[PDB]
Amino acid sequence: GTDSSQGIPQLVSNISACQVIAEAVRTTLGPRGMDKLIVDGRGKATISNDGATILKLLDVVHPAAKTLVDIAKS
Amino acid sequence: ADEERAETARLTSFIGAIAIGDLVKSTLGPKGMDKILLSSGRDASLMVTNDGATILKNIGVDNPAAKVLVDMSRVQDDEVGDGTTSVTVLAAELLREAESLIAKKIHPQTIIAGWREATKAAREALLSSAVDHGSDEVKFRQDLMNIAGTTLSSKLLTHHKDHFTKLAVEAVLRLKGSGNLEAIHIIKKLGGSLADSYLDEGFLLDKKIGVNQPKRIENAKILIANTGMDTDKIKIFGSRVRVDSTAKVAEIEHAEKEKMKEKVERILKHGINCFINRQLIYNYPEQLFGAAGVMAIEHADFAGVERLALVTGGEIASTFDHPELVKLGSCKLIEEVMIGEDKLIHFSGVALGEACTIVLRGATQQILDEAERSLHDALCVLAQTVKDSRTVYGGGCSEMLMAHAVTQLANRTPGKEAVAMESYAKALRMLPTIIADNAGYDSADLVAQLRAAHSEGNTTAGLDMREGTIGDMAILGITESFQVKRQVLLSAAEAAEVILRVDNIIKA
Amino acid sequence: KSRLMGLEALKSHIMAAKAVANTMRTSLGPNGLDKMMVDKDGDVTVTNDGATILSMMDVDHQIAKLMVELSKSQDDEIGDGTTGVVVLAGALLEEAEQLLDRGIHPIRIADGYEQAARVAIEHLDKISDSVLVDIKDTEPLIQTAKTTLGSKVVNSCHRQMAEIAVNAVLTVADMERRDVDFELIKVEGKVGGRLEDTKLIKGVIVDKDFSHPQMPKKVEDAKIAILTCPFEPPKPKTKHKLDVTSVEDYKALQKYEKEKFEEMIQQIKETGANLAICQWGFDDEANHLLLQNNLPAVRWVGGPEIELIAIATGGRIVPRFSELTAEKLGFAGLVQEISFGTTKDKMLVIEQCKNSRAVTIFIRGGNKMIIEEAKRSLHDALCVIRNLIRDNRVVYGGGAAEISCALAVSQEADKCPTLEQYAMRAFADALEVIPMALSENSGMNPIQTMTEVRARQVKEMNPALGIDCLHKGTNDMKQQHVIETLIGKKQQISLATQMVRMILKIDDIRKPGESEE
Amino acid sequence: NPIQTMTEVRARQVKEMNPALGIDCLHKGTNDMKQQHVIETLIGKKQQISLATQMVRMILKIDDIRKPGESEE
Amino acid sequence: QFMEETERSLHDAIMIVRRAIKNDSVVAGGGAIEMELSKYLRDYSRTIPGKQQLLIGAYAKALEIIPRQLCDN
Amino acid sequence: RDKPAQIRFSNISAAKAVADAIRTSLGPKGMDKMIQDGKGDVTITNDGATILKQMQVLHPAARMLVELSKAQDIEAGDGTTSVVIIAGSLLDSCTKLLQKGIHPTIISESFQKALEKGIEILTDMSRPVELSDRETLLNSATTSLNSKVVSQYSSLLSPMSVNAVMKVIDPATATSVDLRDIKIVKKLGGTIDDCELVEGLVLTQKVSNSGITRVEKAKIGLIQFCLSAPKTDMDNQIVVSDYAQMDRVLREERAYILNLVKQIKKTGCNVLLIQKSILRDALSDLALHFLNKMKIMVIKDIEREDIEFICKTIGTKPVAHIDQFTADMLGSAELAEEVNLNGSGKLLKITGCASPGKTVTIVVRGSNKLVIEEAERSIHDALCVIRCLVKKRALIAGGGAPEIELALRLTEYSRTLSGMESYCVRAFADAMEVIPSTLAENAGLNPISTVTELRNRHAQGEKTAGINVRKGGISNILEELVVQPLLVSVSALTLATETVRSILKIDDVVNTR
């Protein structure tokens, strides 16, 4: 079949989808700006302080997470 | 994968060697309850085993802790002899000692040193009550007898031990400076005798010699050869590939009878009537090998020719080319002597001398093997009797006495490690405990009284625990080389202490 | 998979890197306790060697892999120190815990440990910085090749293991170049030898011996015929490989290679090289000819080895039987098979007194782990020795520097007003595991044992005297000849603090769980 | 060890008869009832004898093991 | 494990040194302008609103969170 | 560990447990047992002797008894239930005294001196008869042919049971009369009155068809060779792609062999026993056609029994291929006799052959194996009974009845031993008198009257008498026509002795893996 959802439950989930992701890069980016060891595969363990790389590395399960990648990657 | 921590690494260390250490325990010291090996996993069998090394590999040794003593005890019996049963129990006795110290949380360093410290001091103490019974060669022959007396003990043999005592004695006597283990040749077979161990003239050999070929030979001078055939000769012509049809699968087998006949001629170039091709032949070959006048006698033993390569002044080598390459073996009469319904071609006219072949006729191959290690150990330990006439008194009469000073030492000698050294001087006396109660005696009045009876200097006084008593070691003749006592500790000494200090086990 | 951050990812990082240190700190030092380690392969490995533990260790928690790395770095250059940097990590790791538990920020904590490590490695410089030549170094080398080979279980009764190392880095690499060649030093070992069997070979020992000793077992200086040519089937890459079953082709072939191999062997005798090393070596049929030719020559050779026979001997390369010329002759000082008194051990030493470009330090022993024990003995001995033969800069060990380092750091921590004033002082705290575990390895109560050294360093203010590293009763470091390359502690420290620091800098974990590979 | 210890005067019982000697009651290293001087009124032992089987003889008395709902009540 | 962090300085600098080349117009780094802007913007939260002082206030403050994070991380 | 504790019981348990339900024995007791296995397969079982051999037992000390079951067969052939039933009796004494804390080695020690005491008192109550005296050979076998399969036929077998022995028996008292001694061979066909004592070495064998030798002066063959022929032992010059070539290879085969089969006969052979194995097919069956046409008995892939006896009693050796002729090492034969009675069975009768002074042959005949085994099982024990009289003379009663005489007499010596074992020696001296009571076991209700009456009245037979368990009622059991040779039960003691003693020797933990 086909799935769809509207309005605040979706719309809050629309903004709920996003706010989860921005915390990946949250404390990152700097000298005391943190650094991310992100292991997205069993023997595949990746380290970046940049979002775009881990954005490329991480899975995007949301249109938000999808719509976010380029924005930061921009 | 896996990282194991000390507690299990120590406890599994404790349990396995202890679990295996008590397999032969009641069979150790003198004879208590025996040890039945039930084999239910790999087969269905009722088996009786007092041997650690037997018991070791039979039950699963795959416990890495068990592997240690299984290895260490095996190595020890394989070196000094009858050490497996010891070492398997000894470090098992040891593991219980530190296990309290471990429970007391005594520094792993502490127990290591103190035991190994006391390990010296006891073998040191073992060095004193070690007494030369072999000063005089006849007393040494008597030393060889009592030392072999404690070796052949505790196993299952009906009349067999009597042949091996003198023989482990005689293997030394005629050889001048070592015992004969290899000059002695082991033949383990089922003959017309339910119990026999005897001396083999040359070495007997099994086969049915039928058909045309004369079944006896006289004035044998053997041409010693390792080269030959079975159904196909090794030569330029030894291979033919032809099958184009179903008749050929039948025809291909007939041309096999072409390959046997051409070598029957080749033994005739040397003209040698006594020629060992050490590879087998059948009656139809015996039909063919009886025509020429140069016979190929099949399945000649390697060590039996070595047996001959010793006394005859001949040679044991590989392959063969012409009679002068490998020196001609010579035996007065090669004969076929029937034991039961089966006949045995017997290489004879050569009796003992520099070497011995020993044919054991038992009721079972089982009774044949338990005498070998008995012999094998009594051979080696009587080779220990050679250099060291010292026999230190058996029945653990050394153990308690080894434990005597170390006890008295541990108080004095360490101002700390007495924990280990006493524990050392403790575990030494476990072997007497497991037997003396199995004896019906009260070990508590054994390991310590009789200790301070012999350890304060009546050393002949020792365990006759097959009477359930104190017993006189020299009088019982139950004693064995001082060299059989030390290393069985030294193996077992480290058998324990390895897994003691093992604090982790990584697993792939 | 999941994002793990902060105290979550902290206690993620904390487990194994702390937990792994425990078996290694119980393995710390010679009094360090062995560990039987058994594979799923049925294998059994008894290891007090953390570098071997880490190798043996396949365990999870990627950090627990990163130590398998980090020991190997210090393993080659410094030699010893593989295990300590690991057990020091978990020290300053748990040490880092309660500062965050205090509320000291994850990047506050690491740097306080980090700059305080500068003082440490700086304070380390105060112990002994000496520099000497090889022939002087051997004394501080063997006194350390006591410890190294000995902390590797039986230096005992060996300066044979000790002083061939004095030659090893020496011959392959200069003193001052300090370019690490343990790659040029050939550490070779053979079971069936003895630990009392150890040998320096400045050239290459090739295990393959003369086809027959009936042929001369001594080839003269050089005149080695470099041959990549089949005298047995050269696993030739082109064709379908089939032997013949018929007597017809059985005779047709046997006359064929009797012609070529002989005239090959004679062509070798023609090239003027009375040893023929053959990268595709000798079967017996060529060897009868070779014997019939009375030409000393070498049977099957490893492919790169005949090349290693070139470089290590300075040997000029004759590539192939097609390139043959009498001018190019491989170098061998003397070509002979070597039985050491161990006859089961037979190699053919190509022994270069002229051009030696690979120095074979050849050690022996009764069995596998034995020689391995002796190899990693001979390995890290020389590796510690390589520092000291280059710059012989010695700190005396067993926590004698730790207090010494922990002292200066501690006050200077307080002197720094920065938040890390705690962390830098918290830094000086976890240094004490080094005598601690060693104390308990040596079987002593550390908390007292260590402040002995403190009371020592309160007085001494230098590693000289110390506690027992060898559990010998003389509490000493200098005098106990506990002698550690002053480079290595600086190495070892910087390795611990900075690896952890990135572990501390990485608080952001995308994993399905706390740890992962 | 009783069976052991019992085995001893047993041998005596085969060796000797009705030992005025015996096994140590005092746990003396020596075993008599003489050296132990353990001797009881040849009444009392038989007086004691009278008691034992009587009890078993008592427990059997009648066929009634039934209870109204009263047995020990 | 210390080496990675070093050259990223080398790699970053070039990128932003080149970035300093590419656009020569350059301001203070490290979010210096945001607070000003955060002020400057919700200054309109005084100036803008019939409504959206909220929006202008909420717009103004979100600037600061990046370096505030850098402050807080 | 408590395992040696728990298992030694579990050892004794499943040993004794299975062995306890195993006592229905000696008479129409209980009700028939139809066994359908743990795999669900129907068997109908009865008459525990077979059942003892049928016995399929989990647990090892239970498996110990199947052995122990078979142990009595070749030792005696009588009282196999005995050694099986009394197996629990030793197992009894174990636990009770193990409970008592008696060291099981003492209990293990308790077995021999008992076994030393016990079998002696059986010999002390034993009833002397002879090994060569046809009447004493008859009577023991008679009672052992009375309740065994055939009796009317045993009237023929009892003397042959005896007549076989006087050959086999070596002069007067001699260790003699083994199962290898009397040669027991089934013969297809006839009946039991066709079962006859056929003296010397008589080789039962499958000889191809007839036209064979029934004629005197065989050279009895042992032949490891092929007749060397096209498609037999000799190269075929003809390859077959063709029906003219394929018809050619068998013709050259069959036309050739006809010479060797006569040459096979030319040794004088009325027998050549083929090698049991194949050289290719070994001897072609097209060959074996013409071997028998020259009157030479052939069993291709000969059974094991002939090969040995002919190498043993007759003493025959292999001989050269008849292209080489033979070595005349064909054993002594004056006849190859192949008899069909009922018209059934093919045989080799060798008389005029080497014989040890033993190897009498009995040729056991019947319209089926039933009639055959009817004679066979009966005569065999009757031999084995006489065999026991040979191996150990005198007599004891049948069915453990004398063991109660022992129990009384022994318990005293058990008692008067007054040792650590004496207790055990007393405990097991009392574990005998159970056996007649415990065979009574399975049949019925209002039950228990006779149990101790199966005991007491014997104990009140003085030490000389008790109920006859075979025939019924009290007499002097030892000769009532309730009898077995003295040898029979003294083995049952010994046999069960160390088996149970081995259980006391079970310690720690054993499963070989």
Curated annotation (Swiss-Prot), chain C:
Molecular function GO terms recorded: ATP binding; ATP hydrolysis activity; ATP-dependent protein folding chaperone; beta-tubulin binding; G-protein beta-subunit binding; mRNA 3'-UTR binding; mRNA 5'-UTR binding; protein folding chaperone
Cross-link Glycyl lysine isopeptide (Lys-Gly) (interchain with G-Cter in SUMO2), where in sequence: K186, K190, K241, K251, K255, K368
A GO biological-process term: chaperone-mediated protein folding
Gene3D superfamilies: GroEL (3.50.7.10), GroEL-like equatorial domain (1.10.560.10), TCP-1-like chaperonin intermediate domain (3.30.260.10)
Enzyme class: hydrolase
Induction section of the entry: Down-regulated in response to enterovirus 71 (EV71) infection (at protein level).
Keywords: Acetylation, ATP-binding, Chaperone, Cytoplasm, Cytoskeleton, Disease variant, Hydrolase, Isopeptide bond, Neuropathy, Nucleotide-binding, Phosphoprotein, Ubl conjugation
Post-translational changes noted in the entry: Ubiquitinated by the DCX(DCAF12) complex specifically recognizes the diglutamate (Glu-Glu) at the C-terminus, leading to its degradation.
Keyword Chaperone: yes
Gene of this entry: CCT5
Associated disorder: Neuropathy, hereditary sensory, with spastic paraplegia, autosomal recessive: A disease characterized by spastic paraplegia and progressive distal sensory neuropathy leading to mutilating ulcerations of the upper and lower limbs.
Cellular localisation: Cytoplasm; Cytoplasm, Cytoskeleton, Microtubule organizing center, Centrosome
Protein name: T-complex protein 1 subunit epsilon
Ubl conjugation is among the record's keywords: yes
Binding residues annotated for Mg(2+), in chain numbering: D80
Modified residues (Phosphoserine): S2, S322, S515
PROSITE patterns for the chain: TCP1_1, TCP1_2, TCP1_3
Record family assignment: Belongs to the TCP-1 chaperonin family.
Positions of ATP binding: G29, T82, T83, G398
EC numbers on record: 3.6.1.-
UniProtKB/Swiss-Prot annotation, chain D:
Post-translational modification: Ubiquitinated by the DCX(DCAF12) complex specifically recognizes the diglutamate (Glu-Glu) at the C-terminus, leading to its degradation.
Highest taxon of source: Eukaryota
Subcellular location: Cytoplasm; Cytoplasm, Cytoskeleton, Microtubule organizing center, Centrosome
Expression induction: Down-regulated in response to enterovirus 71 (EV71) infection (at protein level).
Disulfide bonds: none
Coiled-coil regions, chain positions: none
Binding residues annotated for ADP, in chain numbering: D24, E40, K45
Residue numbers of Phosphoserine PTMs: S71
Functional note: Component of the chaperonin-containing T-complex (TRiC), a molecular chaperone complex that assists the folding of actin, tubulin and other proteins upon ATP hydrolysis. The TRiC complex mediates the folding of WRAP53/TCAB1, thereby regulating telomere maintenance. As part of the TRiC complex may play a role in the assembly of BBSome, a complex involved in ciliogenesis regulating transports vesicles to the cilia.
UniProt similarity note: Belongs to the TCP-1 chaperonin family.
Subunit structure and binding partners: Component of the chaperonin-containing T-complex (TRiC), a hexadecamer composed of two identical back-to-back stacked rings enclosing a protein folding chamber. Each ring is made up of eight different subunits: TCP1/CCT1, CCT2, CCT3, CCT4, CCT5, CCT6A/CCT6, CCT7, CCT8. Interacts with PACRG. Interacts with DNAAF4. Interacts with DLEC1. Interacts with SPMAP2.
Protein name per UniProt: T-complex protein 1 subunit epsilon
Originating organism: Homo sapiens (Human)
Full protein stretch here: 469 to 541 of 541
From Swiss-Prot, chain E:
Family: Belongs to the TCP-1 chaperonin family.
Disorder cited: De novo genetic variants in nearly every subunit of the TRiC complex, including CCT7, have been found in individuals with a broad spectrum of brain malformations, and clinical phenotypes ranging from mild to severe epilepsy, developmental delay, intellectual disability, ataxia, and other features of cerebral malfunction.
Residues that, per the record, bind ATP: R19, G30
Primary role: Component of the chaperonin-containing T-complex (TRiC), a molecular chaperone complex that assists the folding of actin, tubulin and other proteins upon ATP hydrolysis. The TRiC complex mediates the folding of WRAP53/TCAB1, thereby regulating telomere maintenance.
Source organism per UniProt: Homo sapiens
Subcellular location(s) of the protein: Cytoplasm
Recorded superkingdom: Eukaryota
Disulphide-bridged cysteine pairs: none
Residue numbers binding ADP: G30
Entire protein: shown range: 380 to 452 of 543
Name listed for the protein in its UniProt record: T-complex protein 1 subunit eta
Subunit structure: Component of the chaperonin-containing T-complex (TRiC), a hexadecamer composed of two identical back-to-back stacked rings enclosing a protein folding chamber. Each ring is made up of eight different subunits: TCP1/CCT1, CCT2, CCT3, CCT4, CCT5, CCT6A/CCT6, CCT7, CCT8. Interacts with PACRG. Interacts with DLEC1.
Cross-link Glycyl lysine isopeptide (Lys-Gly) (interchain with G-Cter in SUMO2) placement: K51
From Swiss-Prot, chain F:
The protein's enzyme class: hydrolase
Positions annotated to bind ATP: G27, G79, T80, K148
Record localization: Cytoplasm; Melanosome; Cytoplasm, Cytoskeleton, Microtubule organizing center, Centrosome; Cytoplasm, Cytoskeleton, Cilium basal body
Single GO molecular function: ATP binding
EC numbers: 3.6.1.-
Subunit structure: Component of the chaperonin-containing T-complex (TRiC), a hexadecamer composed of two identical back-to-back stacked rings enclosing a protein folding chamber. Each ring is made up of eight different subunits: TCP1/CCT1, CCT2, CCT3, CCT4, CCT5, CCT6A/CCT6, CCT7, CCT8. Interacts with PACRG. Interacts with DNAAF4. Interacts with DLEC1.
Family: Belongs to the TCP-1 chaperonin family.
Protein name listed in UniProt: T-complex protein 1 subunit delta
